[PDB]
Each structure stands twice: as structure tokens, then as C-alpha cells.
Symmetry: C3
Subunit: 186 residues, 3 copies
């Protein structure tokens, strides 16, 4: 079979805005859809979680198990950005240093949250099993390899790997031509 | 909207025990509820799996996709200990050496199950995508980085990172004061 | 427990399927008509099977494991098991910047990497691991946890790392044990 909402059920969800050809699995979780926005030709697979301010452009695959903890400051993805399975992107994290208490259970005034908008520029691919922390921009046409971790903004058009990531080599810009060629025949 | 049980439904699950202000997603999986006790101010998110022997104290977040398999020896977590998304704590793990058959499709004679209780002491924080193997004491105040793997027990108030983890710096103890400051005003 | 009844299962429509095959109701099966399962097989909560998967016998597919069979398929031999939160890909999008990617985009603009994934006998894949397309995991190999595998792996070794490196011989005791269990089945 397949797991997706129909254009009908989509509409009843109460999204800030949702495009056309949007396939979201009923096996995903959508928290606070009133601030979640989806452009066109998007797919979100089983067991993803979207919570808080999330904005996705058009022609993005969010693969299974991927969590987007958009918070109040948000996560945004430009067009042709894609995220492989089991990725987490965080717009807000707790403070591990030992200088604060943490998580939901604890009153704000004792915490020390790290928070910043997270943006994923065009043509970003995020490898399977990766993590992106708050306040970072992943640069235009960056690929980040599998099982990688990102704590900082990434320079455009490079491939990064590792925990935390290191720049391994350039990203081909050939996606750009194709983007245009594809867009042409629309 | 949230996916959590009403206190009504909670009790019709029947845990060895279960405190108050305890939010557990309906999208989580609780097996063997009668071997799980749960304190107060505790939250378990979508897609988690609790299995068998699990003891959770008070003031704890267990983030989504987290699996606690406590089989018979169990997992025990103190107060103010937290677990980030997508972690596994294993109280029992198969012998990988070549010397044994494995998993639930096989009789136990042909198996060499390494088992051993897992404890996470006050203020432990496990970061996301982490694994804890059996027979491990995560000392009080220990922070383990995201995408870390833990085989040995670990020293109080330190920060560990890697696969397998290694010690990289002392955790601050100021959270001691804040615990106090905080329980103080109740 | 989570599993489908024997009645519930023959209702899914698996190409083939055997007996004592416990499958969680919280796992996701896609195109069951191209998925054969042997006997004594466990698939836990939140797994995803999609496309050509063949699984033999005495196998555990731990919680959260995704097997993306595609056309080419993923094949496991008997006594192979996979641990929680693993991903097996028989197809994957070229990352180089030489092509677009995803089901959002028409086939011509992509440069999809494809190939059979075979998990031979006694294979054990550790937890949180990723295995790529066109990859033969050799007989009685163990890959550790959090491991990444992009090329074929030689018989009877332990492998760890991202990407994997060979670390030690895996012991073959397991083969005698196998025989002993199989005989104890007969007499
Ligand atoms: C990052 C990636 C694209 C690089 O592939 P590549 O161009 O073949 O690069 P190579 O395999 O030659 O390796 C280059 C270096 O990076 C390392 N490396 C490659 N992938 C890595 C990863 N995910 N994490 C850490 N290191 C990695 C290799 O060790 C090698 O190291 P060295 O330079 O010290 O020898 C690929 O390894 C990858 O991670 N793909 C993820 C696939 C995915 O997530 N798919 C989801 C479904 S579509
Ligand atoms: C543990 C952590 C807090 C430490 O970061 P930090 O205090 O800023 O210290 P640094 O980032 O300078 O890291 C120190 C070193 O460890 C390495 N390192 C840091 N985090 C690592 C990790 N998770 N795994 C492997 N290595 C890590 C870095 O390469 C650096 O190496 P070096 O000693 O060769 O320079 C952070 O990196 C981390 O892993 N956080 C997890 C957060 C999380 O899981 N959040 C879930 C949402 S609440
Ligand atoms: C693969 C495994 C069995 C190897 O364990 P081992 O035989 O105890 O080997 P050791 O602990 O001596 O370590 C061998 C080396 O590999 C490294 N290593 C071990 N496991 C690793 C892993 N998963 N990833 C990366 N490196 C690893 C160690 O740092 C050590 O390094 P060195 O030789 O360079 O000093 C074990 O490490 C493991 O990962 N088991 C996974 C368990 C699991 O996934 N279980 C599912 C539950 S049923
Ligand atoms: C992975 C996945 C697939 N499916 C369905 C829709 C897809 O068209 C079909 C198989 O697609 P998929 O498994 O993503 O492979 P492909 O790359 O060929 O699209 O199964 C879901 O409904 N939900 C899911 O989470
Ligand atoms: C992640 C998650 C959120 N929610 C709901 C309940 C929470 O009150 C709300 C906020 O979730 P969350 O994303 O954890 O935000 P915060 O970090 O501010 O708590 O979303 C669930 O019900 N289940 C979940 O698994
Ligand atoms: C982990 C898990 C357990 N269960 C059920 C079946 C088991 O009888 C019981 C305990 O499971 P588990 O912790 O897997 O025990 P074992 O090590 O014996 O396999 O809970 C599921 O249905 N699905 C799951 O994903
Ligand atoms: Cl997961």
C-alpha cells in the first residue's frame, strides 16, 4: 500500500500553508501545524516528527524517522533541500556544560537554552542519521555525509563529514544546470 | 494537540508504579508495564520503547525514538537524569564474537547473553543517537555527547564523547546549587 | 506484545511467508507482494520494509530498522540478524552534485546508485548502522554498532567504523552450534 494523507485530509490539518502534491504519512507526528508551512511536491515519510515553527519549500523529501524540532525560532528549508532517514534538526538545545537544569520538566528560569533559526539553503542534502544544532545555516548546495554532526554554519558548495563535520571536498555545481533544465519543462 | 495519555488512561496500563505530572505518548510502546515504576514529572515522547525492567525517577525527559530494553536485570535512572532522542540503553546484549547464536529466534543454550544492570545517576544526560551497553554505571552528573557509545561505567561529573567514549573535560557542578535553589522554593 | 495473528498475516499478502513469523503491527510493510519471509522471524515496532526484501529463517529485525528493497532487493540468509535502528539501502541518490535527488524529481535528472544487498549466513549488523547498495556482507561477518558499510565485506570478520574497517576474525564456533540446533530438531 502507502501511508499518505489525501489532499482532502491535508486541508483539514490546519497548516500555516500547504502546497500541492504534498504527501505526508499518517504515521508521522505533526505538532503545532498552525506554524508549519510546506511548498509543493514535498514528501514526509513514516515516523517523522514536526514540532513548532517549520517551513519547507518545494521538492523536498523528509525521509522516515526524521525529527524537526522547529521551536519558536524555527527551521526553514529552501527548495530542493532533502533530508535522509533518522536525521534530527534542532532549533533549540539544552545546556550540557553543567551550568543549567534541563528539558521540559524544569521551569525555564533554571535552564539555559541554546537557540537560533536553522536554515537549509537550496540543494542541501543531509545524510542519513545526522544531527544539526540550533543557529546554523547549511550553505547552498552543501552535502553532509551520513552519521554526521553540525554545530556551525557551513560554507556553500562543499561535502562535510564526521562528528563534528570536517570539509572533505567540493560539491559539483551541476545540480544548478539540471535545476534550470528541469524547471524549464514544467 | 499532544499525543499524551490522560491520567485516566495511564492507570489502565498498570505500571509497577506511576507518579504525577507524567506524560507518555500514545505513540510510544510500553511492554511489561508491571515491571516499570515511574516517578513524578516525567515525559516520554513518540516512538519510544520501554521494555521490561525499567525504573525511572522524578523530573526526567526521555526523548523520542528512545529504546530502553531492561529485560530482567533492568534499567534504573535517578532524578534529573535525561535522555535525548534516539538513544538505546541495553541491559542485555548478544555475544558478537562468533562463539554464540543470538536473538529471540534461538534457544538460550546456544546463546551467551551478556547481561548486567544499567544505572544513570542523578543529573546524567545522554545526548542523541547514543548507545549504552549493559553493566554500566553512568556516574552522577555525567554528560555523554550525541552519537556516543558507552561500554565501561563512567566517572562522576565528566564529559565523554566518541565511539567508544573518552573523557574530555569536567562537567560544572553549579546544577547542584540550582537543584537546591529549586527544590527550596516548593 | 505487538505482533500480527497468524490470521492477520496471511491477510497481508506477502509473496511468500512461513511459520512462527511474528511481525509487529507498528512496523510498516510496503508492497508485501514482493517480500518473502522464511520461518522463525521477528520484526519489531517501527521497522519499515519496502520493495524487494527476501528474509530466510531464524532472523531478528530489531525495532526501527528500515529495509529499502527497491527493485533490486535486499536478501538475508538464514541466521542473519539486524539490530535496532539500522538502515539497508538497495538504492541511493548520488550525493556528488552531479544529479538531483528524491521521489519529488523525475527519473532522468537523478543518477541513482543501485545493486543487490546480500546479508549471508550468520551475519550480525550492530545497531544504528547503515549499509549501502551493491553490497555483499560475507558469511558470519559482524559489523559493530554505528557502522557504515559501502563495499562488500569478507567472510568471518568483525568490522567497526565509518566507514567500516576490518578489526578481527569472527569465530566459527557459531557454525557447530548451528549444526547442533538443526540436528536437535530431527532426533
Ligand atoms: C559523504 C559521502 C557522500 C562521501 O562519499 P565519497 O565521495 O565516496 O567519499 P569517499 O568514500 O572517497 O571518502 C572520503 C573521506 O570521507 C570519509 N567519509 C566518507 N563518508 C563519511 C561519513 N559519512 N562520515 C565520516 N567520514 C566519511 C572517508 O573515510 C574518507 O576519509 P579520508 O579522506 O580520511 O580517507 C558518503 O560517504 C555518504 O556518507 N553518503 C551518505 C548516504 C546517505 O545518507 N543516503 C541516504 C539515502 S538517499
Ligand atoms: C558534548 C558537547 C556538549 C561538547 O561540546 P563542547 O563542550 O562545545 O566541546 P567541543 O565542541 O569543543 O568538543 C570537544 C572535542 O570533542 C569532540 N567532540 C565534541 N562532541 C563530540 C561528540 N558528540 N562526538 C565525538 N566527538 C565530539 C570535538 O571534535 C572536540 O574534539 P577535540 O578535542 O579533538 O577538539 C557537544 O559536542 C555534544 O555532543 N552535544 C550533544 C547535544 C545533544 O545531544 N543534544 C540533544 C538535544 S538536548
Ligand atoms: C563490534 C564489537 C562487538 C567489538 O567489541 P570488542 O570485540 O569488545 O572489541 P574492543 O572493544 O576491543 O575494540 C576494538 C577496537 O575497535 C573500536 N570499536 C569497538 N566497537 C566499535 C564501534 N562500534 N565503532 C567504532 N569503533 C569501535 C575500539 O575503539 C577498539 O579500538 P582500538 O583497537 O583502535 O583501540 C562491539 O564494539 C560492538 O560495537 N558491539 C555492538 C553491540 C550491538 O550493536 N548490539 C545490539 C544488541 S543485540
Ligand atoms: C518509505 C515509505 C514509503 N511509502 C510508500 C510510498 C512509496 O511510493 C512506496 C515505496 O517508496 P520508497 O520506499 O520511498 O522508494 P522509492 O525511492 O522507489 O520511492 O511506499 C510510504 O507510504 N511511507 C513511507 O514512509
Ligand atoms: C515531540 C513531541 C511533542 N508533543 C507535543 C507536546 C508538547 O507540549 C508540545 C511541544 O513539544 P516539543 O517539540 O518537545 O517542544 P518543547 O521543547 O517546547 O517542549 O508538542 C507530543 O505530544 N509528543 C511528542 O513526541
Ligand atoms: C521490543 C519489542 C517487544 N515486544 C514484545 C514481545 C516480547 O515478548 C516482549 C519483550 O520483548 P523484548 O524486550 O524484545 O524481549 P526479548 O529480549 O525476550 O526478545 O515485548 C514487541 O512486541 N515489540 C517490540 O519491538
Ligand atoms: Cl529512529
Amino acid at each position: 500500500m502507502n501511508s499518505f494523507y489525501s489532499q482532502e485530509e491535508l486541508k483539514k490539518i490546519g497548516f500555516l500553508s500547504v502546497g500541492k502534491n504534498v504527501l505526508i504519512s499518517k504515521k508521522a507526528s505533526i505538532y503545532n501545524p498552525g506554524v508549519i508551512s510546506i511548498g509543493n511536491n514535498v514528501r514526509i515519510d513514516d515516523f517523522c516528527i514536526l514540532s513548532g515553527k517549520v517551513t519547507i519549500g518545494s521538492y523536498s523529501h523528509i525521509a522516515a524517522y526524521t525529527a524537526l524540532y522547529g521551536g519558536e525560532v524555527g527551521i526553514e528549508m529552501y527548495d530542493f533541500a532533502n533530508i535522509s532517514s533518522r536525521t534530527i534538526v534542532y532549533a533549540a538545545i539544552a545546556d550540557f556544560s553543567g551550568n543549567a537544569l534541563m528539558g521540559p520538566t524544569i521551569p525555564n528560569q533554571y535552564k539555559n537554552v541554546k537557540t537560533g533559526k536553522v536554515i537549509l539553503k537550496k540543494h542541501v542534502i543531509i545524510g542519513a542519521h545526522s544531527i544539526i544544532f540550533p543557529n546554523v545555516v547549511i550553505g547552498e548546495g552543501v552535502a553532509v555525509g551520513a552519521m554526521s554532526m553540525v554545530k556551525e554554519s557551513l560554507d556553500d558548495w562543499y561535502i562535510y563529514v564526521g562528528v563534528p563535520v570536517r570539509k572533505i571536498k567540493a560539491r559539483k555545481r551541476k545540480i544548478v544546470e539540471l535545476e534550470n533544465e528541469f524547471l524549464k519543462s514544467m
